[PDB]
């Protein structure tokens, strides 16, 4: 259980998007990946650099109403204002009542709750979302982590036929965090790969009856994640991921998981 | 288990609504909570007090076609009529061939199947829905149970910005039953609390790999439930629950889980 | 693990439809059920008999990009062309990193990826879909398997009020494969029966905490399956299955699981 501190800034981007960043003028969409171990406390020294009220609200983690990031709990930030948000986490364990307390561990996310509406509809639309992973002791750690956000009809707020693409090598342990926002349900599909429908996205062993899937229905504020061995049993290639709702996939919102051979090459593809 | 008998009434209510009740003029939307233990049998002496055919149909439980509650199986109820429905439940166990028979236990629900359409579209819209809990031997029992129904764009058929709110004290074991009906998908979200995506909404112990969530996609006739310790690790507070579909949350369709300190107070909220 | 070889054909059908068949002129919607055991390899000698490009794309199974069935990987089929697709499967096992590799076993599906659009919107709409089951050693095998596809507002591309109905006898072990396609989310409900939300749709034992359900939200390209003992604890009957989205159920998009007594009768 470390007590940890980061700085976070909400910025309006040149293009009129809105992003979180770890430093001024370094905002990204999605926002920076926050990673904590169960038991860790994080203090986020947040600065709203924008000319509108903005906030930081987190799913899954332990927070008091004063870190709700809502108008209801007097927890949003005035233009140019500052606020320290506090996120706590806990390990699982036996309560006195003999019950098992579930831990914080999982694939989570943070987003604005007051831009445009008192539910953050405008901030979320403009890019104020990012991933949070809470790890349990012993969890398997990846070679890389990639965050895919279905935000209305967009992926990571990109234009149609502009990715995002993620590169790996065959055999790499690659982690995906998959977050949904906005108005629409979606189905997330990845070619050539599959994962478990459980906390880690990985089967614990032969006694784990979790469905193994390559396609998952998601709605606004859903988060899940998984890890794959890149190209396992399928080889190097351009492995598309996309929404499987037919009108959505036809808008040209598709990304590629580019799995290269150890010589840096990939079977030829036509994007 | 035990053999149980109850009366149930379907009644027209104010503002063109329809509800189930355990007594005449005590109909509620949602309808009364029905709670059974695996193995129990329930006989429901159902009176349709309305001027249109109505029925009772249940998810999850054991029932014969004579208690289907459908026109197909001639088990709806004529206006002003009475019919006894029978719900059975069973415990899990190995079959003779060594497969495992799943038990009845879970978060379930009952609704009308013949008002407006032969799928109960009018009856459900107007409020003919309620919760059923079937418990397993050794299940953890709560201090209170609250039912939240996303019915089209309404919560429990309340208009925009009309709660419902649920009160607890820090430390209470609070059960939620979450049912969806109608036309739309939703995502159910609760601030400051989380649960397991499994039968009871609680992890069985360290071998249970179920995802821990605070947001769940649901569609018409989905039911799930869970228990939380009120304010566990987060303290007293006005803890919002709402649909996270942004247009739905922006219509005011929000309620509060009001978690008080033992001294009866709650951190100031607006 | 066996190496298996089949032929498949894509063909235009009546009423503006398209389907897959094991023989020319024998295409069905849904397409033929393909059943494999973990470790089996299947080579599909696919002939596109149509006047438009078409492909075969599979969920869940092991395939190389040369069997992706996509424009991106140039592995669709010209009109009148033939292509051998290869699907591999694997058993689960312990990896050299100490993790458990998930096996191929599950309820899966295949469909076109290039008719109408580069995502197969037109091919899927018109009937180019079918079920795939991959079994694990020791899995419980059914007496009968039935495939239900929610494709847009249709079931198995049947018109409103067109079933399909499935017949069983009380005590039969009946498997359902449930696949969704198109534009819409659905909720699949079956009267009188329930299943586990897990890989097999059956609880493995008392240590399996999976929710037991009779209603499941599904979206495009979702697949799940389950087995039930027909009429278990409920008896013979006409047992409705339907989408539970109310306007969907109201269109006539409903079928029956017709469970007979041992003497052949159904409560009428
Ligand atoms: Cu909120
Ligand atoms: Cu989509
Ligand atoms: Cu795909
Ligand atoms: Cu695919
Ligand atoms: Cu949120
Ligand atoms: Cu090229
Ligand atoms: Cu029904
Ligand atoms: Cu909603
Ligand atoms: Cu929240
Ligand atoms: Cu129902
Ligand atoms: Cu695809
Ligand atoms: Cu439907
Ligand atoms: Cu039903
Ligand atoms: Cu697909």
XYZ file of N, CA and C in Angstrom, chain B residues 57 59-65 68 70 72-74 90 94-95 99-103 108 111 113 117 119-121 124 182-185 198-199 204 208 210 217-224, chain C residues 140 173 185 187 189-192 194 202-206 209-217 229 232-240 242-250 254 256 267-268:
276
model
N -46.814 -14.059 -15.076
C -45.751 -14.891 -15.688
C -44.469 -14.653 -14.897
N -40.180 -15.388 -14.393
C -38.865 -15.832 -14.895
C -38.216 -16.771 -13.870
N -37.450 -17.744 -14.341
C -36.492 -18.468 -13.503
C -37.080 -19.677 -12.801
N -38.280 -19.547 -12.256
C -38.790 -20.566 -11.334
C -39.386 -21.723 -12.144
N -39.700 -22.802 -11.437
C -40.312 -23.994 -12.052
C -41.821 -23.724 -12.098
N -42.426 -23.836 -13.261
C -43.890 -23.718 -13.389
C -44.289 -24.611 -14.553
N -45.490 -25.162 -14.468
C -46.084 -25.943 -15.565
C -46.761 -24.996 -16.554
N -47.139 -25.496 -17.734
C -47.745 -24.622 -18.768
C -49.033 -23.986 -18.228
N -48.098 -20.704 -17.016
C -47.276 -19.911 -17.967
C -47.721 -18.451 -17.937
N -49.912 -17.154 -20.159
C -49.994 -16.735 -21.583
C -51.331 -17.166 -22.199
N -51.348 -18.516 -25.210
C -50.920 -19.789 -25.833
C -51.278 -20.952 -24.907
N -51.022 -20.828 -23.603
C -51.200 -21.932 -22.645
C -52.420 -21.653 -21.730
N -53.343 -20.833 -22.235
C -54.726 -20.667 -21.701
C -54.635 -20.423 -20.199
N -36.344 -25.595 -6.883
C -35.538 -26.768 -6.518
C -34.131 -26.330 -6.128
N -26.521 -33.258 -8.131
C -26.089 -34.160 -9.208
C -27.304 -34.930 -9.681
N -27.408 -35.076 -10.995
C -28.361 -36.007 -11.608
C -27.783 -37.423 -11.557
N -24.166 -35.279 -14.102
C -24.236 -33.834 -14.412
C -24.812 -33.063 -13.234
N -24.541 -31.758 -13.178
C -24.988 -30.910 -12.063
C -26.213 -30.146 -12.495
N -27.340 -30.403 -11.842
C -28.578 -29.623 -12.064
C -28.480 -28.306 -11.296
N -28.528 -27.201 -12.027
C -28.576 -25.859 -11.428
C -29.880 -25.703 -10.658
N -29.743 -25.049 -9.532
C -30.900 -24.754 -8.699
C -31.658 -23.551 -9.201
N -34.901 -12.847 -9.793
C -35.892 -13.061 -10.850
C -37.001 -12.024 -10.741
N -44.217 -10.639 -14.247
C -44.900 -9.577 -14.989
C -46.110 -10.118 -15.724
N -48.359 -10.786 -19.107
C -48.073 -11.309 -20.463
C -49.240 -11.112 -21.419
N -50.775 -6.379 -25.505
C -50.336 -7.373 -26.511
C -50.206 -8.724 -25.827
N -47.659 -10.251 -25.464
C -46.376 -10.253 -24.689
C -46.428 -9.259 -23.537
N -47.601 -8.739 -23.205
C -47.774 -7.894 -22.015
C -47.173 -6.524 -22.172
N -47.008 -6.038 -23.400
C -46.352 -4.750 -23.609
C -47.097 -3.638 -22.858
N -46.803 -4.313 -18.834
C -45.448 -3.935 -18.374
C -45.258 -2.437 -18.372
N -39.099 -3.246 -21.277
C -39.526 -2.310 -22.314
C -38.768 -2.453 -23.598
N -38.316 -1.313 -24.110
C -37.809 -1.192 -25.499
C -36.302 -1.034 -25.519
N -35.702 -0.503 -24.443
C -34.347 0.066 -24.523
C -33.334 -0.749 -23.732
N -32.094 -0.752 -24.207
C -30.949 -1.127 -23.356
C -30.621 0.029 -22.404
N -22.048 -12.260 -10.804
C -22.323 -13.696 -10.587
C -23.711 -13.842 -9.985
N -24.041 -15.042 -9.544
C -25.420 -15.329 -9.085
C -25.828 -14.386 -7.959
N -17.670 -15.695 -4.014
C -17.819 -16.870 -3.129
C -16.621 -16.996 -2.200
N -13.159 -17.345 -6.859
C -14.236 -16.881 -7.772
C -13.688 -15.805 -8.704
N -15.093 -14.103 -11.056
C -16.136 -13.194 -11.595
C -15.620 -11.757 -11.643
N -24.494 -3.481 -18.407
C -25.471 -3.410 -19.515
C -26.617 -4.383 -19.273
N -27.860 -3.885 -19.450
C -29.094 -4.668 -19.213
C -30.096 -4.345 -20.318
N -30.896 -5.345 -20.636
C -31.972 -5.179 -21.609
C -33.283 -5.691 -21.055
N -34.347 -5.524 -21.831
C -35.683 -5.938 -21.399
C -35.697 -7.388 -20.905
N -36.242 -7.534 -19.707
C -36.436 -8.752 -18.907
C -35.155 -9.256 -18.247
N -34.051 -8.505 -18.298
C -32.848 -8.900 -17.532
C -33.156 -8.709 -16.054
N -32.651 -9.584 -15.218
C -32.655 -9.352 -13.757
C -31.329 -9.794 -13.167
N -30.830 -9.010 -12.231
C -29.668 -9.387 -11.422
C -29.813 -8.714 -10.078
N -20.271 -32.917 -22.109
C -21.612 -33.552 -22.191
C -22.181 -33.326 -23.608
N -31.855 -34.312 -23.667
C -30.780 -33.318 -23.453
C -30.699 -32.523 -24.742
N -29.553 -4.735 -30.717
C -29.397 -5.582 -29.503
C -30.744 -6.306 -29.319
N -32.795 -9.389 -26.409
C -32.719 -10.237 -25.215
C -33.395 -11.570 -25.530
N -35.021 -14.975 -24.515
C -35.727 -15.564 -23.347
C -36.347 -16.897 -23.738
N -36.279 -17.875 -22.872
C -37.001 -19.134 -23.069
C -37.893 -19.404 -21.850
N -39.154 -19.716 -22.098
C -40.069 -20.094 -21.000
C -39.751 -21.508 -20.525
N -39.896 -21.723 -19.236
C -39.880 -23.043 -18.618
C -38.493 -23.605 -18.397
N -33.885 -22.755 -18.078
C -32.863 -21.780 -17.658
C -31.500 -22.425 -17.902
N -23.933 -24.867 -18.716
C -24.292 -25.774 -17.611
C -23.324 -25.520 -16.476
N -23.842 -25.434 -15.252
C -22.919 -25.364 -14.120
C -22.115 -26.650 -14.058
N -20.873 -26.488 -13.687
C -19.935 -27.616 -13.656
C -20.119 -28.387 -12.350
N -20.661 -27.752 -11.334
C -20.713 -28.315 -9.982
C -21.074 -27.229 -8.988
N -21.022 -27.536 -7.673
C -21.404 -26.565 -6.642
C -20.408 -25.401 -6.498
N -19.992 -20.369 -9.630
C -20.820 -19.253 -9.157
C -21.541 -18.519 -10.294
N -21.475 -19.073 -11.487
C -22.037 -18.390 -12.674
C -23.514 -18.070 -12.428
N -24.014 -16.895 -12.860
C -25.465 -16.624 -12.771
C -26.220 -17.657 -13.627
N -27.330 -18.110 -13.085
C -28.340 -18.925 -13.771
C -29.419 -17.946 -14.248
N -29.702 -17.999 -15.519
C -30.513 -17.014 -16.241
C -31.544 -17.717 -17.117
N -32.567 -16.972 -17.514
C -33.468 -17.385 -18.604
C -33.647 -16.255 -19.615
N -32.797 -15.248 -19.549
C -32.923 -14.019 -20.365
C -31.518 -13.477 -20.525
N -31.097 -13.182 -21.742
C -29.687 -12.786 -21.966
C -29.644 -11.719 -23.046
N -28.980 -10.620 -22.736
C -28.771 -9.521 -23.717
C -27.653 -9.926 -24.661
N -32.332 -30.052 -19.943
C -33.160 -31.277 -19.940
C -34.600 -30.829 -20.200
N -37.581 -30.312 -17.686
C -37.091 -30.683 -16.342
C -37.784 -29.796 -15.292
N -38.487 -30.427 -14.342
C -39.194 -29.745 -13.236
C -40.412 -28.976 -13.706
N -40.736 -28.980 -15.005
C -41.807 -28.106 -15.553
C -42.815 -28.913 -16.380
N -42.427 -30.090 -16.867
C -43.327 -30.928 -17.687
C -43.372 -30.584 -19.165
N -44.106 -31.397 -19.907
C -44.400 -31.180 -21.331
C -45.117 -29.882 -21.556
N -45.001 -29.373 -22.771
C -45.695 -28.143 -23.120
C -45.158 -27.500 -24.357
N -45.900 -26.539 -24.875
C -45.395 -25.570 -25.856
C -44.704 -24.463 -25.059
N -43.367 -24.481 -25.092
C -42.511 -23.553 -24.319
C -41.973 -22.487 -25.262
N -42.506 -21.285 -25.159
C -42.126 -20.145 -26.019
C -40.652 -19.797 -25.844
N -38.388 -16.297 -27.319
C -38.592 -15.048 -28.053
C -37.577 -14.016 -27.628
N -37.444 -13.000 -28.432
C -36.787 -11.772 -27.978
C -37.698 -11.156 -26.911
N -37.139 -10.559 -25.871
C -37.966 -9.919 -24.815
C -38.000 -8.408 -24.982
N -37.373 -7.841 -26.013
C -37.556 -6.410 -26.336
C -39.000 -6.283 -26.829
N -39.828 -5.471 -26.214
C -41.288 -5.665 -26.362
C -41.746 -5.473 -27.811
N -41.281 -4.433 -28.473
C -41.727 -4.193 -29.871
C -41.266 -5.374 -30.734
N -40.099 -5.988 -30.438
C -39.642 -7.160 -31.210
C -40.618 -8.320 -31.037
N -40.923 -8.684 -29.795
C -41.802 -9.824 -29.508
C -43.177 -9.560 -30.140
N -43.565 -8.287 -30.214
C -44.917 -7.856 -30.675
C -45.030 -7.990 -32.199
N -41.252 -15.005 -32.650
C -41.532 -15.998 -31.577
C -41.488 -17.409 -32.175
N -41.573 -21.916 -30.763
C -41.917 -22.879 -29.701
C -40.906 -23.995 -29.590
N -49.702 -30.939 -23.732
C -50.810 -30.135 -23.193
C -51.327 -29.106 -24.198
N -52.579 -29.255 -24.642
C -53.026 -28.730 -25.947
C -53.388 -27.259 -25.885
